Symmetry: C3
Subunit: 136 residues, 3 copies
């Protein structure tokens, strides 16, 4: 727990339907916390950068069945930064997955929003993780 | 080769059918070692954590043709931790890919098991990699 | 900007057709630079290792529509090291994604080449990122 050590990792462990709040914010959440060094990943959904630096993020959102399609956005402070897609009607399961490095200021917020579609059948096995590569 | 420096990366370089041992253990292996700092990735398949800390892992298992479906599990000490899927009959090639951070104790073992399906046509171009993000 | 701190991340921000030069080299490029600490990622396409060490790389190339198929190769000094595929005619959007750790000498060049297919409809939302895990 030095301040150079910041990481989190989370999974959706069940096929439960989305909560009301997730339903309105459209923000995807992950209930099983595998890693949360620094406790800067809060509300099962959003990471708050503790300091200025480069941060790695990666996500893998699985649609149990066709949705029809979903578009997942990686959000930084209310603006979409990266996008991923899961599309075909016949194909299940399909995953909207992507990853990236980001320059973050202290208090910056990174999280996943669902732009299109919904996680109706649950999004079990979906993953969200990130860490501080180095401070700046 | 300081003890803070631990990483491995591996690929399946051919389309050869699985070995007998892999056939019985159902544990996926990777013959071409790109990186293995610390030599803690052994038997082409399993990583043994040298010390307590946070470790990144990612995998990308490719089914050459429909299997029909495969489910790949990321294993920690005999228990499944993360899962990925490659499904459709018509779609080739499809990949079961996922990744995660894990809190590991010294001597913890992380590896890939094939829960469903088999790698009959070979799993060429498949990748397995991981590293120590920081010690704890 | 210490010499242990090396990272880059890039996105294709539009659906514009490939440039003439990209057309001839078959080398994929990314116009929106999210991160480029050390400025060792140049020409929107190729990373030049500043020092000996282990480097993480990951890519996610999206074909807007069927191509028919694309094969993307991760190149190190003119030789393919890792491969990824996006295949089916009916499926859009599909992604050729993969990642890996590599042992790199100073001046080594890592970049993405398009072995099969073409990025005709654009490759918007595609990502290419990498960083120095540790020096050796
Ligand atoms: C949430 O919004 C969806 C549309 O995405 C709607 O169909 C559903 O009924 C709403 N409520 C809940 C609890 O899911
Ligand atoms: C291994 O097990 C599979 C079932 O997954 C079986 O069909 C095959 O014949 C077995 N032996 C070998 C060498 O693959
Ligand atoms: C580039 O090469 C492709 C084949 O991949 C060709 O069809 C196209 O006309 C060429 N020129 C441009 C500007 O894309």
């Amino acid at each position: 727990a030095a301040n150079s050590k910041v990481a989190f990792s989370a999974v959706r462990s069940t096929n439960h339907e989305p909560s009301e709040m997730s339903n309105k914010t459209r923000i995807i959440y992950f209930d099983q916390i595998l890693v949360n060094v620094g406790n800067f990943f809060t509300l099962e959904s959003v990471f708050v950068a503790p300091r200025k630096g480069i941060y790695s993020f990666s996500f893998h959102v699985i649609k149990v069945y066709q949705s029809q399609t979903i578009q997942v956005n990686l959000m930084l402070n209310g603006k979409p930064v990266i996008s991923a897609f899961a599309g075909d009607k016949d194909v299940t399961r399909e995953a909207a997955t992507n990853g990236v490095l980001l320059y973050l200021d202290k208090e910056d917020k990174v999280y996943l929003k669902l732009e299109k579609g919904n996680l109706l059948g649950g999004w079990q096995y979906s993953t969200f993780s990130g860490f501080l590569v180095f401070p700046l």
